[PDB]
Amino acid sequence: VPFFVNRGGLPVDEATWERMWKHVAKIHPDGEKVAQRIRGATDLPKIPIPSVPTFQPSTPVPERLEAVQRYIRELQYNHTGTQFFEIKKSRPLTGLMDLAKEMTKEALPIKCLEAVILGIYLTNSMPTLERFPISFKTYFSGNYFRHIVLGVNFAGRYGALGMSRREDLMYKPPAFRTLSELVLDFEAAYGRCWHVLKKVKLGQSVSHDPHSVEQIEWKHSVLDVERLGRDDFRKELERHARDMRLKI
Amino acid sequence: MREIVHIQAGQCGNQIGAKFWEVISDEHGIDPSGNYVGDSDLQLERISVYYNEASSHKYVPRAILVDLEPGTMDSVRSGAFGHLFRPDNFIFGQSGAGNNWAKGHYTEGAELVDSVLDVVRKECENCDCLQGFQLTHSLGGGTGSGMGTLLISKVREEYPDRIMNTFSVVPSPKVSDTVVEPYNATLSIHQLVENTDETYCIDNEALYDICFRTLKLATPTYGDLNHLVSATMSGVTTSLRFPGQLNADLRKLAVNMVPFPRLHFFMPGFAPLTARGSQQYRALTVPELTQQMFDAKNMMAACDPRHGRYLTVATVFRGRMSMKEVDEQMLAIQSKNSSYFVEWIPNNVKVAVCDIPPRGLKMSSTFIGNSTAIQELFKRISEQFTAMFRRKAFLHWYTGEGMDEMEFTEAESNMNDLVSEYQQYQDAT
Amino acid sequence: SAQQELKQRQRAEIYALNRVMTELEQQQFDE
Amino acid sequence: MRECISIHVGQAGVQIGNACWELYCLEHGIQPDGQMPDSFNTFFSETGAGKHVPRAVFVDLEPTVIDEVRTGTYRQLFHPEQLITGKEDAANNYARGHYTIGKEIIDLVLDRIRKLADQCTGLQGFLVFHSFGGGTGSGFTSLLMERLSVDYGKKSKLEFSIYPAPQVSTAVVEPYNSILTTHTTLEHSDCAFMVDNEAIYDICRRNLDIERPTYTNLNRLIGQIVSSITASLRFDGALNVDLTEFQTNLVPYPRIHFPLATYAPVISAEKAYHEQLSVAEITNACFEPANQMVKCDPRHGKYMACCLLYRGDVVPKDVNAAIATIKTKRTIQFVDWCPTGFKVGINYQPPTVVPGGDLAKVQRAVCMLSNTTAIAEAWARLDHKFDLMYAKRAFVHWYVGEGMEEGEFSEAREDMAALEKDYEEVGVDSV
Amino acid sequence: MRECISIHVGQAGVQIGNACWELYCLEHGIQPDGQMPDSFNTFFSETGAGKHVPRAVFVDLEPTVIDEVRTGTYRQLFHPEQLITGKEDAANNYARGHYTIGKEIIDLVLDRIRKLADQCTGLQGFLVFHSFGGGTGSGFTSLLMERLSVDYGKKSKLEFSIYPAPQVSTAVVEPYNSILTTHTTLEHSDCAFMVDNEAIYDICRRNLDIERPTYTNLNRLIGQIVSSITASLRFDGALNVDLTEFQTNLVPYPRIHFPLATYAPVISAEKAYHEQLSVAEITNACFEPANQMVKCDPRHGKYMACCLLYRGDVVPKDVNAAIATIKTKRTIQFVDWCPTGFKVGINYQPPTVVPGGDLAKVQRAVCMLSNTTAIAEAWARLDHKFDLMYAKRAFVHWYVGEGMEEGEFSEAREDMAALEKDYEEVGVDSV
Ligand SMILES: Nc1nc2c(ncn2[C@@H]2O[C@H](COP(=O)(O)CP(=O)(O)OP(=O)(O)O)[C@@H](O)[C@H]2O)c(=O)[nH]1
Ligand SMILES: Nc1nc2c(ncn2[C@@H]2O[C@H](COP(=O)(O)OP(=O)(O)OP(=O)(O)O)[C@@H](O)[C@H]2O)c(=O)[nH]1
Ligand SMILES: Nc1nc2c(ncn2[C@@H]2O[C@H](COP(=O)(O)OP(=O)(O)OP(=O)(O)O)[C@@H](O)[C@H]2O)c(=O)[nH]1
């Protein structure tokens, strides 16, 4: 459960790597019995390194975004509860986008957070596409978890990208009418997994220049779920859907 | 002062060289007797790139004229500039090889080429800092393709640091005046890859195409095609002789163009090219003439540059330019046909300007493209040569001399590896 | 620092690891 | 005392110095003959006959550039034993300026410095002038400034390099000859300025209202900045901004010596009357991303330590008052770990007019030198653009055949990326 | 202090300011060269050279209108950095003013305001000038008034909009681009005056005894109103009618900021001697329905709160005496819930004469700004006129193809009908 702040993903060291198999003695049911079939196995399944699809110029925006998700769905999303990278919020962009240059080369099991990063990195060749990050504050029984998506905008219509543990928080096709009902698909996704919502974090639109040094603004607006009106969720977030066009 | 001895091999190279020095003797204001009658002293301060001095105010061009065919010496000896050249430099044999390559390289050329290197070493001794050797010849012929490559492999043995230029007029499939043109062409290129470090594969089809379409002359009577390749021959070395805002030597071009040591085959191009009396007065304007300079019609090699992405491009301007308007236009060209350039060479269009135009214009700009669509120039010849080599026709005129039969199968593989090497980057990234 | 050996033997080690961890995170809630 | 010599390398080095020393002759009344018809001694070691030899050495390996200066105007001003000149251009090549040809003419240049560094009682520092666009400007300067810091350890050395633009480009091998330069200019240099050449076209088109500026319209705007940086050494005011003072008033670490220059005002003669050019307007114009002298947006990054250098009819009352607007109630965020602000470099002498007719006269100026962390996006191009070329091993054989080992590019990129990681390191304080 | 800039937009907006700034130079002695041969600083930020620069931002997306100003007379008065100019005219298309082309040139107009709003110690407010007749006057202003309300929240912003006339018309999409702009000016604006274009012909026909008036005989009368509204900020008297302690004498509710202007006297030169132009007839002329600036009859509706803004040689004795006849002994019925009456804006400065020869000089003048509910009859002739066109869905495909959602007309008509219900809501007190 507590993800680490380690460095040197490929190749791995001899300190962070040895605690991957001690942590599974608590949450995974076997713990040490799987070490004879994972660490104690010379033979292993050879999953290759898939490449990012270099799109031809006769491929428009929504055909590319499925081909973007056709990369990240085959990226083997991680469940081990330990981060493999050096991803931070307060991080410069070229220190982060060049870390995404070490995502196609490394291609380790990744979590939901850097999928938002790689969703930005695999979308810089679409200047008509405007993106923005949205993080959720999900309420379990007394606890607060985070789920961050990447909301997109092409031809006026909305949509969102991202990865999670289940299918209902993944890629949304870019055909939604407004922005408020787009979050409602995530809100209906939280009703199935027995999740309550607390806050919706709106951020500034990420600038379309991959070689630049600025921090990514994730907290341009905060929408408290249980402590604000439902009409304000369809009006202030609708004006914020136009306010992202107001900066531009 | 960087120096370049200039070797007019062959006969067509001698035909374009008699119009090459006619450009330069006008460009420095040198009379046909050899004196100086120029007005501005900025053209006199550096003439030693292309000239010498006699014991007066009388200059003599650093030129070596080589042709097995005689009599065409007597054209330029009795032409408009017969009293300009050094008469000791006129080297010519007796017979004249009749469109043969083995004759002219093995048998006939070896009995003459030692007289040349006693002159090219005589001219290398009066030069302070030698830059390179230009030589202008016709590929596919007898002399300029068989004596020329013998002359290069003897020069590059003695000077492995000096640069080399080769303005080889390649053969064309539509305008061919020789039945053994696809034999002398494919034998020359194997001895042209390994020795020269930048050629200029001009063609004689696109020169005929320019004088009908672009220049719109009635009759291209060979005083134009031998002149139009002379303007883009002075245009490469117009920064060595004139103070520019941003100037480029021949070493600067060959360090900016070839990404690998085998890819030196450049299709040159010159602009502006008006009509004879219409566009030079009425229609054409002369800022941003790169739209003319990048067109498929205004090339020298008869190849379609849209059929293959450029590797590197050098545009040597000449006029009194304005370096924003040079470079802002140069970005707009690179962003327009952005699929027509190699990905892994970003910002490849080399600029270079000067301060003195040709006499009779205001601005002018050559263009030296190192395209990959030059593989279409070699896919025609290696189609025609492989057709005749099946029947093995016209082979006793080469195997009759001291040339083996396996030399052709070796020379075709050395060409087809080059077309395999040039196709290696058209599709990869 | 030799590569293609440590970065593929321990790369497929996690690939054999998360196959049960993917199944574990979807079996704790099926009620 | 307080002498300061300026060396010039490359085609960019002389063409700036042809118009840089054009400006100093107007800033001291010195004729083109060197014969003044007070204190010019920071730039002119005069002779007893009445002449004034400028303390500069022009270096180029190709003779076609200096012979313009050696024969046109200002041909009697310079000293003919100091215009060092090679024969081969070696151009667009780092190794041919650092190993092959530049190795030959170093012993004539470095000897000529010691024939000028032995006339200085107080030597403030060296002022190199080159471009990163290949040839001698990066090949020979990497050999020169490595050779100077051996013989002159405790001496400052400025660097007015012309960093290559992202889009506007001249050399094809332009990214290769800049990754090989920063391994030199990280160690041996000090406060290496890096102006760009595309960013002046975005200044000389809107701020200065002329169309299609030549290289004589950017090498005068680069001349005024080296004037007003060294305007403290030769005039009066409330300055105390000599080159050893503002050096460690600027750099926070030995690796963050890459500020950007910015001049203001640059308004043309037509709109010189339609705007009152007072000190609140002059500083507020000096912080625009459309007014910097490099292709970077400083709003994206954060300033570490600026250094304003005013000159002319200002007073420190409203200079310090107009600063507090820009200091506090703006969104140009400074870094957290230094709240002291920035140097103020008030000088008395107003800037002059070069008579070529480019920008009209004013009463105030500023050459702000911000050590922002927005230079990490200037190297973000060339860390990628060179790596895009080196992946296919293009153009390497023109360096590995000249003396350069093939592993040098794998060393230079490895160093220059760790610098960019180090530049983005000091941008954050709180967790 | 008390500076007040004025932005202009449209074919109407520059053509008014071409003749409005013609008037202010006469009201301060300013030459056409901007060089006065006291206190003008509410309209002129002067320079130290003796010049004067007007504080106005002439914008238009089409170049053919400002180039009349930029080439003829008054070409040296303005500043060339502020005459913002696009390339496409954005031909009568609100979506081409609010989404397509106006989005490109917003960041230059908004940048020029902060280069003028930072020279203002006391900023009274903004004075926009546009027409509701399509194009940039309605499309680009809706992208501008929405823009200024973010950066300048607590700041007044007047609006001298031209309303589309009922019968006289120029555009075909005049009713389309006026329902779309009132969704902007209902919220972001403040005291949006809406003069008409037909009603000034019926002043230039009978009150002014000229025939065939051009747009120069009609923009002089719209320049005199903006003169005597801002005659409190730059002259003396018994005023206290600055634009924030006057606009809270206007609005009873935040949605009723739509007064009408009315100027008096407008008597021609040949009729100037045959009438003693004194304050009894001068005040009674303002309430004639044949003397309003909008084609509407205020005898139909009821006034809420006027604002009589005098100027010239008056005294407050008979001002308060001539008011009481109009207040009580008349049938111009006020609304019941405000019995205090209206403001009084006595100023000392008499109005001047533009030398084009339109109206001779007088000694008194009014600009009464009545917040009557007779503007509801100026919208029922637009609510019906728009819905007659939208019922057949004509011309909608020139907006939905330009980046505008088709449901916005069903929102703008829904909004502006609820405003008309709200404007008629406060018309009755007792049952
Ligand atoms: N560019 C030009 N090429 C020419 C011209 N005249 C002929 N030729 C070209 O040159 C070719 C023939 O010239 P060559 O010098 O090769 C004939 P050869 O080598 O055998 O020497 P000689 O027999 O002494 O003439 C011919 O196929 C054409 O392609 C010309 O005027 N200009
Ligand atoms: N800003 C500016 N840059 C210049 C100027 N002149 C040349 N440059 C730059 O110089 C770069 C090319 O490098 P060079 O200065 O020619 O260095 P070099 O190769 O050693 O010089 P040569 O050997 O004589 O060719 C180009 O990228 C230009 O940007 C100038 O006048 N102003
Ligand atoms: N009162 C008045 N109205 C005018 C005058 N000139 C033009 N107009 C009005 O202004 C409108 C012209 O369009 P603009 O407001 O400038 O906006 P636009 O559609 O973009 O026009 P352009 O900028 O020229 O393309 C017309 O509907 C006229 O009614 C004038 O002099 N006085």
Author numbering:
A (entry chain C): 58 to 305
B (entry chain B): 1 to 429
C (entry chain D): 26 to 56
D (entry chain A), E (entry chain E): 1 to 37, 47 to 440
Quoted from the paper:
Microtubules are built from αβ-tubulin heterodimers that stack head-to-tail to form protofilaments, which interact laterally to form hollow tubules. The newly translated proteins of all α-tubulin isoforms except TUBA4A contain a tyrosine or phenylalanine at the very C-terminus, which can be cleaved by the recently identified carboxypeptidases, vasohibins 1 and 2 in complex with SVBP (VASH1/2-SVBP). In contrast, VASH1/2-SVBP preferably detyrosinate polymerized microtubules. Detyrosination of α-tubulin regulates the functions of microtubules by altering interactions with microtubule-associated proteins (MAPs) and motors.
Using cryo-electron microscopy (cryo-EM), we have determined the structure of GMPCPP-stabilized 14-protofilament human microtubules decorated with catalytically inactive human VASH1-SVBP. After seam search and 3D refinement, we determined the structure of 14-PF microtubules decorated with VASH1-SVBP to overall resolutions of 3.1 Å and 3.8 Å for microtubules and VASH1-SVBP, respectively. VASH1 simultaneously contacts two α-tubulin molecules in adjacent protofilaments. SVBP does not appear to contribute directly to substrate recognition, because it has no contact with microtubules. Compared with crystal structures of VASH1-SVBP alone or bound to inhibitors, there are no obvious conformational changes of VASH1-SVBP upon binding to microtubules. Our 7 Å lowpass-filtered EM map shows an unaccounted, continuous density connecting the last modeled C-terminal residue of α-tubulin to the active site of VASH1 through the positively charged groove. VASH1 contacts microtubules through three major interfaces. Interfaces 1 and 2 are between VASH1 and the globular domain of the α-tubulin molecule that VASH1 would be acting on. Interface 3 is between VASH1 and a second α-tubulin molecule in an adjacent protofilament. Interface 3 can only be established between VASH1 and microtubules, but cannot exist between VASH1 and free αβ-tubulin heterodimers.
